[PDB]
Structures are given as structure tokens and as C-alpha cells.
Design an enzyme around this catalytic site. Structure first.
Site, mmCIF file in Angstrom:
data_model
loop_
_atom_site.group_PDB
_atom_site.id
_atom_site.type_symbol
_atom_site.label_atom_id
_atom_site.label_comp_id
_atom_site.label_asym_id
_atom_site.label_seq_id
_atom_site.Cartn_x
_atom_site.Cartn_y
_atom_site.Cartn_z
ATOM 1 N N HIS A 177 69.586 45.454 -2.460
ATOM 2 C CA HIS A 177 69.245 46.172 -1.201
ATOM 3 C C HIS A 177 67.799 46.699 -1.268
ATOM 4 O O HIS A 177 67.329 47.190 -0.255
ATOM 5 C CB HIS A 177 70.274 47.209 -0.771
ATOM 6 N N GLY B 267 67.118 57.629 -4.675
ATOM 7 C CA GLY B 267 66.292 57.036 -5.733
ATOM 8 C C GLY B 267 67.069 56.691 -7.005
ATOM 9 O O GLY B 267 66.448 56.170 -7.930
ATOM 10 N N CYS C 203 69.615 54.594 -7.313
ATOM 11 C CA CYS C 203 70.117 53.206 -7.379
ATOM 12 C C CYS C 203 69.492 52.454 -8.560
ATOM 13 O O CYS C 203 68.321 52.679 -8.923
ATOM 14 C CB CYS C 203 69.859 52.471 -6.087
#
Ligand code: NA
Ligand code: NA
Lengths: 304, 304
Positions: free
Chosen positions: A40, A142, A144
Site C-alpha cells: 500500500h 508510520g 506499517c
């Protein structure tokens, strides 16, 4: 005398990097000459409801990925997608690459999370894969690309990569082959998690821990059968208990001299009557994030 | 959405070694060319009630210390005592020595423990220095010489070295200059810990965390004064709250728009009425092992 312990994080720390694509910065996992991160990262705010990842990735060039390993900018020489992970081929093999495996864990098993921001570690904690394949994490914007892992002997088993927060505030992500745990997809859409249940075999392990640490008030002289206990498990949304679960609890049963079906009767009374304002191992709720293997490890001092 | 997070442990892992003296094996901390460990390593079972450490150390030679850093046997070239720590001078400076400081923490402050056995890390967890200068650890036989630490920026601040378990099953140890926290001595004798209290400023930080994470049921429209609150703190063995505590809670007060003396009134009602079978951040007890600084860090994603 019984703490929720995470694995030592050093072998994972040397693998964490920062990945930026446009305005989006998250974390990547640098093993050999590949950086793994959530696909993503290639989305823009306009395309997050139902991204066509194949089309979006075709639009991207190696130059659209800025990978930073502390100071070192780390040149991307190729990009591919495996399920919901992006693999960025880089020009340098990580000299700090540990011995590792990629594993897909079962619901009910535990692992440590190294929570990262901007490619930098912020902290480490232990948690369970819930029966509905979510995790009750501590993840901000942030986070991920932060990973979950176990260590056995000298080998890091990576089991989880963080992707998203669900409407209920719990977390979803993938194995390191990019396959989601649970029914979730990388679309920023309302997605139902199953009904969650309590991990019965873990609650029983944690009651064995309490007995080992002298906390004993909840023990009763009674016993039950898997059948009769499971009737009460169903009532309180506890997973059903199997003979495999009894067998896994064997070391804790032997150590304490308390049969599993005797501890099941104690758990039955706790579910039916509550804790009457008492505590077990300094908790007022039944704790389900310790596997039998986690209790055996912490009670026998296993090292890595 | 709010986990008890430990610091990343890698910088400490590369410092842990095994120290053996006779039948006794415990852990040491290898920084530059010195290994630090508890001086009780030089005791025998006959001399543990009231060891004359000066006499015992004179009897020892460098050859009586076997120091192992994984595979490497690490030659001791000198031995001295600083308070209750042994400093073993070794022939090799640790190439993995991080930037570090030795700090003496205050009661109520938190730190991470890297629990070790045989010089090998087993796990990492966060805990508080209790107001009575004990710690509620998870430590077994062989855990002595395990250390507690904080990280600020790039620097490891070592604050604790593990020595012993007290009759109540809590833990005692020293700073890295060998000075015990609390009234304790390295004599294997019955030793009173003070009355312990709950760390009020930490409970209030953790209630701010709950509000930040949407858990709000306990908020009431009332306010109190430090004087009136402290009358209730005394009743429930909570530390008294000071204007310095209010000031330290300022970021959490500003973030949430809830004044400290308004949150104090909420805490008052929780102490007086209990939680009525409800939970805060998935706990049924008031949690006191998060400093205001720990909540700010975890809510703002500070990294190292
Ligand atoms: Na490039
Ligand atoms: Na020697």
C-alpha cells in the site's frame, strides 16, 4: 514474579529500514539484497478505497522508492509484488542479515513486535494472534512494515508484517509472503473481523504460571470433562479445549501435580463466579496472551 | 491500543557475558575492557549470611573467574570491587560497546530489563522502580547480573544490575556503581522492604493514555485540589501528588483538554467506588508502571 516478556530484538533491529514512495513513509525489512514492505506504500489518497495494485505498480519506477538504512541511501534496482508485499531488490546485501525463516503462525500463538517509525525501532512487546486473526497492537501512523517474530535457538522466524488498523481499533497484517491473516484485504474500507474468543489453552497455561508462582486461591477439589467444560467455554466465548491442548499443557500439569481437567474446573468457577475482588499474578482479568510454551520458557529460563 | 513497551535491546545484547566463580554462574556486563557483575559471585554456600567481601576477594585470583562471551573465553587481567559490584578487567575491549552512561534512577521511574541466563539473553520487559526501591521482576536462578536500562537518542543509560530476591518475592539490586537501591545489603538474610505505595503520577499518566485511546467512562465533571486529593491518596497508600507532578502531566493535560485536578477527581472516584466491573485499556486494576514520559513517547512514536 511473572512478566509478559518479548524476545530480544537486536537481530531484527539491524534489518529495519525507511521506505518512502511520494508523501508515504513506512518501514521495510532488509534481508540479503531484498527490502520487504506493505504494497500500500504505492497508493495515493485518491486511490485507497479499491486500488488496482497491478496498474499502480506498473506506473512506478525503481527511482520512485527512497530506501534509507540509517544514513546509507540504499539503491533500488528492481521492484515486484508477492501477494500484498512489495519486494524491493537493492544493490547491497544487508551485512547484518540474521539467520531467518518466514513462518505463518496459527491463531492463539504469540510473537514479539518491534514497533518502528521512519525505519527506526521505538519499542518491543509481546502479543497474541487473536482467534479472529487480528492483533491488539500499539501502532500509530508510520508503523506499517513493523514485523512480528519469534526466535528459536539462533534463527529469527518472521511471522507478521503490519498493514492496517480496523474500525474496532485492532490491527491486521500479513505473513512475510504477503498473505493476510484473516479475511482482510488492503483496501481502506470497513471490514468485519470475526467474533473474537478467549484462547482457553493460554488462560490455563497462565493459571499454571500462577500456581508455580504460589498464587493458588482459585484451585478447587473438582474436575470436569472436555465435553462439560466446552459447554461453559461456548457460553463465555472461550475457544473449545481439545486433547491436543491437554497434551501441550502436560509439562505444566506434571510440574504442579494439577491435572488439566482439574484446572478446567477452577477456570469454570472463575468464569461463573468471577474473582470476588481478588487478583491472579497481579491481574483482575483472565490473561490469554501466554502460550503453554511461553510459560515453560519463562519458568525454565530458555535463552537464544 | 496501548501496550507496556520495552526499549529495543540490541545495544545491550552485545554487552552480555557469562561469569563463573566456582559452582556460581551469573551474567556480566562487558563495556570497553571491563566486565561488571554482582560481587556475591565470590561467595560459597557456607559464607552467604554475612560475607566479609574484602577477605573473600583477597583470596581470589584472576584465574578464579571464567568469563565467556558466546564462544570467546575472555581473559581476566585484574579484579576490583566498587561498592557491591565486581569489576573484572579483561584483555579485550568489547568491539560491540555502545555509547553509554551509568545513571541512578528515582523511585517511580521505569526502565527495560534484559533478562539473561548463562550470559545469553532470554527476554526483555518494562518495569518500574517501586517507591520502596524494589522491582517486581521476573528473575530465576542464574539471572543475577542482568541489567535495566533506558535509551535516550543513541545512548544506553544503565540504571540497574540484578542481585537478589527478597522474602516477599520482589527483587533488589544496585546501580552500575554497585550502590543498592533501598536499604538492602548483599547478605542472604531476611530484609524488610518499606511499605510500598502506588505511583500516583503514573496512574494519572495511564488514565490520560486511556482518554487518548477513547476509553473515557471514568471522567467526571468534578475537580479537586492537591490537598484534598492527597487526603485520599494517604487513605489508599498512593504517593502524594506535587505541583511538579502536575507540570510533568502538562503535555497529556493539554493534548486531552482535561486539567490534572479534573483527572485527580476521576481517580478519587475510582479509588472510592472501584471500577464497577468495567475495564480501562483492557485492565481491571489501576496501572502505575507508565511514566508521563512513557505515555508521551508511545502516543508520539519516539524512536532511538
Ligand atoms: Na533506484
Ligand atoms: Na585470567
Amino acid at each position: 514474579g511473572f512478566r509478559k516478556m518479548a524476545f530480544p530484538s537486536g537481530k531484527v533491529e539491524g534489518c529495519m529500514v525507511q521506505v518512502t514512495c511520494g508523501t508515504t513513509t513506512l518501514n521495510g525489512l532488509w534481508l540479503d539484497d531484498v527490502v520487504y514492505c506493505p504494497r500500500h506504500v504505492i497508493c495515493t489518497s485518491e486511490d485507497m478505497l479499491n486500488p488496482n495494485y497491478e496498474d499502480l505498480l506498473i506506473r512506478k519506477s525503481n527511482h520512485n522508492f527512497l530506501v534509507q538504512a540509517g544514513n546509507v541511501q540504499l539503491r533500488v534496482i528492481g521492484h515486484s509484488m508477492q501477494n500484498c508485499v512489495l519486494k524491493l531488490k537493492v544493490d547491497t546485501a544487508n551485512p547484518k542479515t540474521p539467520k531467518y525463516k518466514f513462518v505463518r503462525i496459527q491463531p492463539g500463538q504469540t510473537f514479539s513486535v518491534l514497533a518502528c517509525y521512519n525505519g527506526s525501532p521505538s519499542g518491543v512487546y509481546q502479543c497474541a494472534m487473536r482467534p479472529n486473526f487480528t492483533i491488539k497492537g500499539s501502532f500509530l501512523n508510520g508503523s506499517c512494515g513493523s514485523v512480528g517474530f519469534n526466535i528459536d535457538y539462533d534463527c529469527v522466524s518472521f511471522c507478521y508484517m503490519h498493514h492496517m488498523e480496523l474500525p474496532t481499533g485492532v490491527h491486521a497484517g500479513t505473513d512475510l509472503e504477503g498473505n493476510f491473516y484473516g479475511p482482510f484485504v488492503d483496501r481502506q474500507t470497513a471490514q468485519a473481523a470475526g467474533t473474537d474468543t478467549t484462547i482457553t489453552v493460554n488462560v490455563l497455561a497462565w493459571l499454571y504460571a500462577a500456581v508455580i508462582n504460589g498464587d493458588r486461591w482459585f484451585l478447587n477439589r473438582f474436575t470436569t470433562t472436555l465435553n462439560d467444560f466446552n459447554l461453559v467455554a461456548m457460553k463465555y466465548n472461550y475457544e473449545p479445549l481439545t486433547q491436543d491442548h491437554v497434551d501441550i499443557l502436560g509439562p505444566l500439569s506434571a510440574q504442579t501435580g494439577i491435572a488439566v481437567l482439574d484446572m478446567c474446573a477452577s477456570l469454570k468457577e472463575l468464569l461463573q463466579n468471577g474473582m470476588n475482588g481478588r487478583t491472579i499474578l497481579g491481574s483482575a482479568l483472565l490473561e490469554d496472551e501466554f502460550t503453554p510454551f511461553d510459560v515453560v520458557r519463562q519458568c525454565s529460563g530458555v535463552t537464544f
